[PDB]
Design a binder for this molecule. Sequence first.
Ligand SMILES: [Cl-]
Ligand SMILES: [Cl-]
Ligand SMILES: [Cl-]
Ligand SMILES: [Fe+3]
Ligand SMILES: [Fe+3]
Ligand SMILES: [Fe+3]
Lengths: 238, 238, 238, 200, 200, 200, 200
Amino acid sequence: PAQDNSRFVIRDRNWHPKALTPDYKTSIARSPRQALVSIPQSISETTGPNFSHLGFGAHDHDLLLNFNNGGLPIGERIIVAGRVVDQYGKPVPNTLVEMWQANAGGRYRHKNDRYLAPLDPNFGGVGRCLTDSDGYYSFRTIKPGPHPWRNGPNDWRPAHIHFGISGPSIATKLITQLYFEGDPLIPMCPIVKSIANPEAVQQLIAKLDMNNANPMDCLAYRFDIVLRGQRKTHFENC
Amino acid sequence: PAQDNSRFVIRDRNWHPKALTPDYKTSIARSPRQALVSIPQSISETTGPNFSHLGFGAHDHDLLLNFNNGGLPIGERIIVAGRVVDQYGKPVPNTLVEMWQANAGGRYRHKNDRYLAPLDPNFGGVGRCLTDSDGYYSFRTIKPGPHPWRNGPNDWRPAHIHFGISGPSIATKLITQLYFEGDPLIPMCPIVKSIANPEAVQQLIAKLDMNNANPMDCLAYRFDIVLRGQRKTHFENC
Amino acid sequence: PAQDNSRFVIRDRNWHPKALTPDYKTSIARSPRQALVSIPQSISETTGPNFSHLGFGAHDHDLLLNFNNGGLPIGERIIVAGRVVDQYGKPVPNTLVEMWQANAGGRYRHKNDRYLAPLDPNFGGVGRCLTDSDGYYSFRTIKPGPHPWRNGPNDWRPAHIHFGISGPSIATKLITQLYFEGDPLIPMCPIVKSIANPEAVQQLIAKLDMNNANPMDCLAYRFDIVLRGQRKTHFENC
Amino acid sequence: PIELLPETPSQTAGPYVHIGLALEAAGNPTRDQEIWNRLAKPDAPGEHILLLGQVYDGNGHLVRDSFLEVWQADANGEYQDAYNLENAFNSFGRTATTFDAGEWTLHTVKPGVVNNAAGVPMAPHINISLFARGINIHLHTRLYFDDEAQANAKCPVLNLIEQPQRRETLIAKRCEVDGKTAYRFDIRIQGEGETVFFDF
Amino acid sequence: PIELLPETPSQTAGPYVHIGLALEAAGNPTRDQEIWNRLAKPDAPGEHILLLGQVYDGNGHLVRDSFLEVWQADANGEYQDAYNLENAFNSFGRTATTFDAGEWTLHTVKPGVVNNAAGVPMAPHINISLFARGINIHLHTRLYFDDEAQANAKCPVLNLIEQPQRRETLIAKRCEVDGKTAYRFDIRIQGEGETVFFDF
Amino acid sequence: PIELLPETPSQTAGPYVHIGLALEAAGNPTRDQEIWNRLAKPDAPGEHILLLGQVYDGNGHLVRDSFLEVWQADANGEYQDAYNLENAFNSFGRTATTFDAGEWTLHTVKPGVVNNAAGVPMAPHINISLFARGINIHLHTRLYFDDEAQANAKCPVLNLIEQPQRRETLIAKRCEVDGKTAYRFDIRIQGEGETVFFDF
Amino acid sequence: PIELLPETPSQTAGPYVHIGLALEAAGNPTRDQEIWNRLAKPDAPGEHILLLGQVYDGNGHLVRDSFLEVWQADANGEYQDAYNLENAFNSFGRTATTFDAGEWTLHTVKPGVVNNAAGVPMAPHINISLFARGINIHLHTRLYFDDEAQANAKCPVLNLIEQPQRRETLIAKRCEVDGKTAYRFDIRIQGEGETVFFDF
Ligand SMILES: [Cl-]
Ligand SMILES: [Cl-]
Ligand SMILES: [Cl-]
Ligand SMILES: [Fe+3]
Ligand SMILES: [Fe+3]
Ligand SMILES: [Fe+3]
């Protein structure tokens, strides 16, 4: 079983978005009004699931092939790859990375998305993988289109891919969104702007990565993820 | 019939791309080695076709509907609109604007494009219209995907739409390409870089135009076109 | 009857003042706490009253003569003039512009104003007019004095004139306040500072306009007003 | 991106708004023609109705300095933009709450059904813009009618309000005032029962 | 001071989180192996229990698109981190409310006692992380059990909550669902009865 | 100096130009009205002729993806600018080489004489603009006729070409295609026998 | 975008390259082991062949200071990277043209067929890199064999050369030299008959 043998650097909750960011309208009634209660790290917080023994299908990381209903999905073929490290720069190997997204037209394969842009019969929009022994992950997919949404009267999400990363403990687990280099919708989005610090926003922008492209085939973007720094315990209970 | 009653400002052929731009490989054998011969403007050059009496189909300007084979095309719904003016700022009304492009995945509906990204059965990629009485044009389309091509070993066109504009004379007629705000492929493209002056390159970049979007429907880009300045003749033959 | 043939550029509600601006104390209890609900433009929102046939009295625009009780009002004689345009720069002709203000000493002719500075027996402080066929309006008045008010313990409104403008639809209707070039009270006022963006505050400052003055008679200020941009509908329901 | 001229920013109408926009309500002398709260003369077609209401702040206290503008279709569902005091009906009007009269009133007809831009019928409604001291940019709302339950349930605008409970805030209550058909429409700017406000 | 690499900033999971993390609920086909809400096979040691709950926003309305992750000790007070669908017990699971009734469920065993880092026993608890549209960074809480009053009263984590009234928000209520032992744990994100949320 | 707005810079038409401007050739369905290579209906006044040619790169290889626009006077020396598929004669047309058809063709009439701006007659000519993959800005040229030698020798435009040998590159050769009068006009973009190209 | 460390830029090998890389050809003393032009010892399996050629500049004049490196499969179509002078066959070798010997030679076997990355057979070929004074970055080419016409016509690499005429530049000519099978492969760096050079 799991043991308590590490501590995780405390989060900077001014680097993360705050709970109440009213321009993102749904945050108004879904943000606690009382202060969070700080608690010390115990085995409950410094452990978490490891997914080495989860059985992955052959195409789980490949959205060009994992919803195959007779052809390839339409849209910009791209690899999305990167490394997961902690704040001390240490790679996070064998960690679960999950992603989901709209299709090339900004339409989600979810019963609750009724945007008029069509579904793609060969695109599902979900991927997962484990980072390798050096911390690297990769997916193959279609670049998602911007998605209009009922916030302000003319609000559009930038092209984006949702990410979840497990990391070594429940204290490191993170959900975030990847955006794409140069997208002029990024500075306009109230969800992006839930993050107050412009330097933090930049950490969510994947860069075009020609070095990793397959010529005559697919482009590539690089998106690195940094989880909370992990250290050994020291001088505790003495 | 047409008459000679105007002169057109001479082109700046250092603002335009030169003929020989060897990084765009096909220009090497398709560029004249002799100098162009300058000739004075006559009725042959200062007149040209007007297309007011050309019959346009109902959807000629609407690529979401003009190749309808049972559904909508997949991809980012966009209006592409702008104004055609001359170098003196005068609008160019009732002028022919034609455009063509790849689908959302960078695949062209042309027999000679065998890129592995699929065709979209509801996308053709061709539009035309006339500017209105104030010089404005409008198309509705899907944002095209980047297109890999056999130039260098890992070359990709930025997302682009080809444009042709007739203007008042054969001296004004122009073919060009529209690129999209922020696209990280633009600075990398040897076709873009056939234009030596960075300020000229900027003139080909369409800007995101939220003011012209249809909320919950389509985004919009603005691309203005400037044709050679037209003036009356003066003090000729005397 | 009125028709739905136009759309209005969506408002920037971070350019306008937000509802909750607590230094302006009355806004604390008079600001909704739930998000506004965005709704699409319909004929209900894109139409509005046209006041071309409202009957105006001879002096409705002239506050030096419209409260005549035997003399001229005391204070700085000024013309207040400007142009109403939309965000596309298009003039807004035959539109209703209404204004009200304190007298030269900061005293309003309302029962609820009990400031100790006296009323002026020949000043009422209310005006209205229509913009002309080119979008221009003009009033003649007395420059209002600063007005102390029970917000903070020593708060004073800068000299200001309240404005209401109808525009082409209920979607364009606006109430605002004009301030005067150079007034050192402007940076100190919590109502001015309800506007977060300093560039937006600058848009409310009327400029001294010597070109429009009557020598030996009255000075003049220029205050231009920009209403929401109006465009034709395009590609709707198709 | 394309950036147009910015719109002139809103400011509060302030406590003395009635001197500029509600002269009779301010107890000040009126001009020959004023824009006020009688949208319909007795001979206007349609069902003649009295509308009335009070406006409350976040502490549940009366707002006695509010200024309201209203815009509605005629009984035939047509908006009449040619404003003229000679007309039997005007689609536009103004009213106010004051120290002396904390309850605004409007004299109008019940509006006919109007389709949205997609051709879908909206339930009968009056568009309202609310201004006052403390209100930095005016608040848009709609007054619907409790005797139009079937139409209300199908209104594409009401249906953009996610929570059914909040839709109820826009439904005016039918009553009789001195023998004549009336509806009460109270507005709560903030807190419990907060009225839905729109952006468009 | 020493400044490490900044952590990647959180963003909301958004309303379509189920596409990626709760495939059944998105309306979508599942893969061969999914991480879901049945932590215990019937043979797992311990007292088998159902957990269920609803999640409320600040207006008292159901949050019908919530996604929850849970982490708990097994009946013997051991955290089973080697996730495997073939395990008798997994310490980790996922659940979600969805539209309909807004209720999530988890099938598990009652967790055994584990000590904090100072060696002081914590009362039996399930660690929960809550994600949804409108939630920019996930909310951490703990579910404790109302039939563990003595242990709860001595828990060094519960005792870090200054007000006893707030401690009550973390105590799940024993009940019965189809005749079987269950505990209900409702979460109120905002306002009256607001659930305690933790930082660590 | 006075600097006007810069002209929009040219870019190559690229190899798929036919999708937009020569639909038949792309392999694609045509619209009801297309601008193409038949300038003259059978009843048009003048001498009906076929024009055809091939286009060569600097290596002597065929340019199979060429797109050409032409502008010429009618038989009476009049430029017909009101383009209409119903016209007996259009002064404007388009043609292309293609892989299937590495030769372009045009069906027209021999143009009548037009004067230059100084009133000097120009020899009969067709103005041509050439577009293709590899061509960054279109190349302007003129097709003159080998059976107009006297007029050609006096043409004020041909006489601006310094070398008589280069003038020869603009003279199309009379021939017969399927027994009918034709003129062949090959274009050599680069190198030996390079076609004269104009700036104006 | 992602920018890696830039590659160290190439420079010409210069006229004295042989002192560093072709010691015998420079007429300088050799070390005990040199990398040179005998890829195959007599015992190597396969068809033993002599390769020879001359290198020409853009003026048609001999390049008498060229240095060539070659890389080829063995007769079975396998690349042998373990370079050792004891091997009966090495896949790599070096040769040169000099003032005394303007025609380079190689002693090898005919390479077997190798598939491309898509599994499509390439025609038998030798990979060549050419270096010299005046050559700033080396030129990559391939030597194919004129007695492999059927395979050559189907080679996915030869078929990336757009013009059939240029494909012919890569086809070495079979002959006999002192009774033994030979192929001549001349390279023309520039101009008429310019040899195809590759980027990869
Ligand atoms: Cl490393
Ligand atoms: Cl204009
Ligand atoms: Cl003007
Ligand atoms: Fe293209
Ligand atoms: Fe005031
Ligand atoms: Fe999303």
